[PDB]
Design a protein around this ligand. Structure first.
Ligand SMILES: Nc1ncnc2c1ncn2[C@@H]1O[C@H](COP(=O)(O)OP(=O)(O)OP(=O)(O)O)[C@@H](O)[C@H]1O
Ligand SMILES: Nc1ncnc2c1ncn2[C@@H]1O[C@H](COP(=O)(O)OP(=O)(O)OP(=O)(O)O)[C@@H](O)[C@H]1O
Ligand SMILES: Nc1ncnc2c1ncn2[C@@H]1O[C@H](COP(=O)(O)OP(=O)(O)OP(=O)(O)O)[C@@H](O)[C@H]1O
Ligand SMILES: Nc1ncnc2c1ncn2[C@@H]1O[C@H](COP(=O)(O)OP(=O)(O)OP(=O)(O)O)[C@@H](O)[C@H]1O
Ligand SMILES: Cn1c(=O)c2c(ncn2C)n(C)c1=O
Ligand SMILES: Cn1c(=O)c2c(ncn2C)n(C)c1=O
Ligand SMILES: Cn1c(=O)c2c(ncn2C)n(C)c1=O
Lengths: 433, 33, 437, 436, 426
């Protein structure tokens, strides 16, 4: 279940970016997480139509085959919560199936002026079962999104809670970040928890307060440290708001909240459901790798795009000063279209049409053969093509492909390191056999 | 000895830990990419 | 001839796989297969016309250079089989030549309404003996395909069935596969090998005929002797066992090479009806030579990742299609005439088709085909839409699919080079090379 | 700070090109240069508008976060100098900000015949706050560049002079480059440093003022002592030869030349306010990635030029064939009565082939009319196919690679240097294995 | 001064391809070829821009990759070739001012000069001097490098005859072209004209004179007892006309001679700059380095285009009407040959598939089928096959450039005549 995924992920980072010096400490932290995961598991335990249809079926099959995995009232409610907790990866796969189904339904969308303003009508090939079905699967998608966010809150929130408890307690009783020093939004945010009556709700050390107080009881007085560390009756407001804030900080919780928000907004406009097809990227590893390859070299890519913009601005100013009479795109003589009569318009023309031309800006501009400045404009066009299309676009593309290939090679290297060497002992597999 | 660093210049395929001594395009330099 | 190719294939397989512990077992297996090949070999032993012609001759020469290499009835029946099996590669060469000639003649077809609906007829400046040439060439191609299927039945089918019986006996004896467990799920070969045991002639070509006796003696105490005998089964028409025959046909049909040759033959027969199905026979040159086979296999080497990237491109275009359908719809007027305009994104299906078929193939983005936003609203939005679409498709996704196929081709060549170099610096028994000597 | 960046460049150079035999000598030289800068630092111590605005703000943010660079008169003059030299990098950053602001303002320019001949005037969105802003920004940038020139002259130029004197004296007393031998031609420095021997202020920056005496004692036996005395010139306070040598050595410096080019472009920006676009290129010199991209082209300059020459001769060989054999298909006009034959002279056909055919991307046959139902169809088809497969497939890819690979190799060299320093001690070749 | 280049070529060759087991033998052969190399030396507007790029290109080419009746002509042969290249560049530059017109000076080839009437006589004098310098170069080659190659051939023949005894016992004339050609020189009395050992016949007649009859070897090798060595003369002609460099120089001379018939024939001499510089030679040889694989890939592309052409011919015939006029149609796929020509010529170079030219299938049958047809055509041709063809040549050129760097690294890394690295030498 989730413990295997956690183990594989831990190994992935601990070999990709984890040194041998702190590998044992990271392993100990992972075994500390694992025990809490087992406790949680024990707690929850007791024509275009035919071609499009074929293509969608093939795509869904290949995607699914590689990824996407009143006391009695209270007694019923806790069982309901446990039921949602037990099956979460199945609900996340059902939501993905529903999104694909409703997107295939939306693929038959038509717009016409006359009613069935510009109205939108649904085309049915003599099958009236489809229009109510769209609303039905929309309702089920909203319901399963709610179930998924409830399950994530139930089974994954305590993991991040207890990890943050590890981090802050280890910082406190080793370094004393709040007594011997001061911090880093996490430090300012977790700070309110220190004065709470019950800090270690999810951790073993329920008597850590005395340990921290006695550790630095000589540098600071007892009263100096006591103030820092401190249903309706048991409503720990500071602890609960801290838990809500760290829940909000979680990236996967933000993803689930965005999914729920998009599902709710899809009722207002049915075309908002198209954003739910981006979950296939997270389902399969290679699509996630492709998506992350863009941000792997984000700073250098931004610098390269800035250089491209700067050089296009240089060509724009060069053309604006000299080569502007040849920018008449309109064929009609009575009504001209002066694209370089304004600096902003000419810059937009160079950025939008010059880059995508593929053969330089000179393709759109008029031929200078029968006019002066012929050699100057020929040199301008050739140099523009060579400097932009040959150089900068190729550099950006090569950076993207290099980042992608580097990510694949990192994954492969992690796999070979796992299969060629023991995790605990530094000896290789040759010694074993 | 036989194994070579990641981006250190190599001479032929394998003969390093990376085992893949590819060259970037027309570049003469070959490394365990 | 055959033994050298088999040896080269063995070395390629072992070095490419990288297995070291099983190297000795693979060597012994090749040794016994080699003895089987020698025994069976001993058994069978005794104007546009001129330019097009020049180009076809050069292509045929280069393909040839690389990639080409009633008592009285009893003796005749085996003599025919021996002579046919002796020159199987010659038959394949003849088939390739026949297909090349047929395609060269087919390169001179025409259509016309009037007779010599639409009718297909052949024309030639003089050369009235080229249509009968094709008529004869089709018959010779069909005959040579039949000869090829017979030669493959004689050459490799005994080897394949002998190897299958070999691993079956090895699994029965060394592992005790059948008497201690069942293949169960998957294991198509294991499930298909069930009918073999009841056949008395289990080692029809395998050397030892006491394999059943060894299995019964070894596993006759833990498991019942009667059960083992029942599992093991303990006028030529009556003596022939049906189940072994069905196993033989199943193994023969399952073989990839026999399937390819049967497809070749069936295309040869189908060619007589349309006279244009012989074009599929030109793919034989791809399998003939290592280079084109590697080029073809590079496409399927990363098939799963290629499908992932294609699906990502499709869903990415789908979002752009939705955005265009909801917002940028007046710019998709392809018709120049105002009286009769057409909208590519009036419907979602045609909008997606236009975005996928035209936008990806454009090379400059979807913005080239659609009307430019010069003097209309949403100009900045349309510019951003086109720029982002063109980037995300051409620079990233199309580059990455091409990237995967080209990288597969490169590695398939790098692995071949590494295998060739390793065989020059390794002894294949001891881990020493040219350094020692 | 300055010492940290200097050590980064020194270690990068040593790991990249510096040999292991002279690595210790390079370390000693760097320490010699580093100590001299310590006292130097000691003495100075005490709608389209909205989208364009958003894009400019984002670009400025990313480029800034990527690593962008008479008694009373005497006491006041030095105090201003140290104040200026303390924040030279901030002055470079301010100059970059000024250039970016002017260039963004320059985007709001419209040209029309009518006054507000062709008149270049400013058209704003009902905000007249930009018309004097451009002028104030122009003079502010000019003043900033002037102060930057002065600060670079006062701060880093003395280090260059000290280094130059260091190698000059070292060669003079350890190799006899001037009296035992002659540097000869092909070396401008060999003749240029000849003017400094007779100057009494030779060790102005170097701490060894007795180099002349030592080199006189060393070579006093092999060569006549009078020869050494005449060669080194051993016998209000204004000299000419030393000042000329100093001027030559600063003009030789690349950074001073670049700053003077910046200053002269700033002056040229007053003749026309639209000339300030050249100041926008300072971003490339700031961030390492764009500097490496620029150096990629120069890395394979000879190969690039020679490959372009090969492309030119190939296009010439194709143009002569087009001119002699098939030129009736070179009509680019659609009107029958008005021809536009692009192949009637060798020069014009060559220009059409190179300027249009190379950039076509699909061969010269794309623009040329298709020879469907005419003679020479096979010849023309082979001509177009071979032209494409050579020019746009092989040669053009080679020219593109000669820059893309070069950039990639530079990046790989930088990462290799980083890894080598991270996994190997500088002083001793002991790896991280034993040292752990 | 000149033997240095031969030394560089020899050492680069032995490091690049020469094995370690034959390194000593290759050194011996190089030294034997080199001793007499010293004895040979002891016996010895648009106009202005066009001018600007022409001068720049000439400067770059010059900078990188440039008894007494034959005495001064032998040492200056290398400079003579540079002089010929300069003349070729000059005549090529003047060839750029041609024009065609119907008026008198039937299309005519005349000159357009900006008041420079001394251009046609200059071109005539330059052509005459170019053919003269080509004649001088072809004259000097037979006295400069031909003795070296014929001496090498005599060396290899002597080694074969002595150590192996191929001619007397093996006798492989039919198997190879050289074996047949070398049979004539054996009977010649002037076999060791260039070889130092003038008594190579007195050794093999007792090395193999016992098992085999001496009377046969004596007659086979010309042993007997003005000066016209006919058989040696024809052997010399064969080896000199079989030489690659001699053939190239003869081709250059014949092209110069043909340039008098038409000045445009002089454009072929611009390829000499390719062989002059190493990297241009690398670019030229990268195509032939993977020639077999390149031709096989081109053939696979051709058969793929043929399959697409026949598929279109059976089904998509009415979509290939290029002519816009309805009265007069241009049917490009009414014939298989024409459709194949259109697919190979236009479809490959289109860059976006065959469908960018042919008609839109919207509003007609076979719409999705043709959509798939063109999608597959684009993906299989432009995305895959053209990319692979380009990548093969790019990789060949990259590895060819890498080979020289590796040769230099092994030059500066390990002791060539000792086989040990520089780590111990330090
Ligand atoms: N201490 C270790 N314990 C277990 N496996 C280890 C250890 N150190 C390294 N490994 C490697 O981890 C891998 C464990 O198996 P692997 O993850 O490849 O999948 P598996 O055997 O199919 O089963 P599972 O995924 O269920 O563990 C092996 O490659 C093994 O060599
Ligand atoms: N134990 C080994 N068995 C076989 N070959 C070995 C062994 N160790 C090294 N080799 C080398 O591996 C190569 C295999 O030789 P093989 O007979 O298969 O070559 P081939 O491809 O048929 O070519 P050729 O006939 O030109 O030598 C040879 O170069 C041989 O020297
Ligand atoms: N002899 C050496 N002296 C100093 N540093 C060395 C030496 N050998 C290797 N190094 C490495 O050089 C680096 C020292 O540089 P420094 O302490 O300034 O930081 P850095 O690693 O370059 O990174 P950053 O400055 O971004 O923190 C370390 O990575 C260290 O391992
Ligand atoms: N046997 C050898 N003789 C000479 N150099 C050798 C030998 N073996 C290896 N080398 C290497 O060759 C290089 C010497 O260069 P070389 O002998 O070609 O001189 P050169 O290029 O003619 O002279 P110069 O460099 O002075 O212009 C060194 O890197 C040396 O290590
Ligand atoms: C229950 N429990 C643990 O599971 C634990 C621990 N320290 C480490 N671990 C893993 N402590 C103190 C603890 O009480
Ligand atoms: C004064 N001084 C220095 O300042 C100095 C030096 N060596 C290096 N430095 C920096 N020596 C020898 C010296 O005398
Ligand atoms: C006379 N002579 C040579 O001239 C000669 C030679 N080896 C090479 N040469 C050139 N030997 C061995 C020799 O005796």
């Amino acid at each position: 279940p989730q413990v295997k995924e956690s183990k594989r992920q831990f190994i992935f980072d601990v070999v990709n970016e984890g040194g041998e010096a702190e590998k044992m400490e990271l392993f100990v932290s992972f075994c500390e997480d694992t025990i809490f995961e087992m406790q949680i598991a024990a707690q929850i335990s007791e024509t275009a139509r035919e071609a499009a249809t074929a293509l969608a079926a093939l795509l869904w099959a290949v995607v699914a085959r590689a990824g996407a995995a009143w006391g009695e009232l209270e007694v019923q409610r806790v069982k309901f919560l446990n039921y949602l907790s037990r099956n979460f990866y199945t609900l996340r796969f059902l939501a993905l199936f529903l999104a694909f189904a409703i997107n295939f339904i939306l693929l038959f969308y038509k717009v016409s002026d006359s009613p069935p303003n510009m109205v939108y009508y649904f085309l049915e090939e003599s099958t009236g079962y489809m229009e109510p079905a769209l609303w039905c699967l929309s309702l089920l998608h909203t319901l399963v999104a709610f179930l998924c966010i409830i399950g994530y809150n139930c089974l994954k929130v305590p993991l991040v809670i207890f990890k943050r408890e590890k981090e802050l307690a280890r910082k406190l009783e080793f370094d004393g970040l709040y007594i011997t020093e001061q911090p880093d939004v996490k430090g300012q945010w977790d700070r309110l928890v220190l004065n709470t009556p019950s800090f270690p709700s999810n951790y073993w050390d329920k008597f850590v307060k005395r340990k921290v107080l006695d550790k630095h009881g000589d540098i600071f007085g007892r009263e100096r440290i006591a103030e820092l560390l401190g249903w309706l009756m048991s409503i720990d407001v500071k602890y609960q708001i801290w838990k809500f804030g760290v829940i909000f900080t979680d990236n996967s919780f933000l993803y689930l909240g965005w999914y729920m928000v998009m599902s709710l907004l899809g009722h207002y406009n049915n075309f908002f459901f198209a954003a739910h097809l981006l979950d296939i990227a997270m389902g399969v590893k290679t699509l996630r790798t492709i998506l992350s390859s863009v941000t792997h070299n984000g700073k250098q890519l931004v610098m390269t795009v800035g250089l491209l913009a700067v050089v296009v601005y240089l060509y724009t100013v060069v053309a604006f000063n000299f080569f502007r009479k040849f920018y008449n795109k309109s064929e009609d003589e009575d009504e001209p279209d002066m694209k370089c009569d304004d600096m902003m318009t000419c810059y937009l023309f160079h950025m939008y049409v010059g880059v995508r031309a593929g053969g330089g800006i000179g393709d759109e501009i008029e031929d200078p053969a029968g006019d002066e400045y012929e050699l100057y404009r020929v040199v301008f066009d050739i140099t523009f093509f060579f400097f932009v299309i040959v150089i900068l676009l190729a550099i950006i593309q090569g950076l993207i492909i290099d980042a992608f290939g580097e990510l694949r090679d990192q994954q492969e290297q992690v796999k070979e390191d796992m299969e060629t060497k023991c995790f605990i002992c530094g000896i290789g597999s040759d010694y074993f056999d | 000895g036989d194994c070579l660093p990641h981006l250190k210049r190599c001479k032929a395929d394998n003969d390093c830990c990376g085992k893949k001594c590819k060259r970037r395009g027309t570049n003469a330099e070959k490394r365990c990419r």
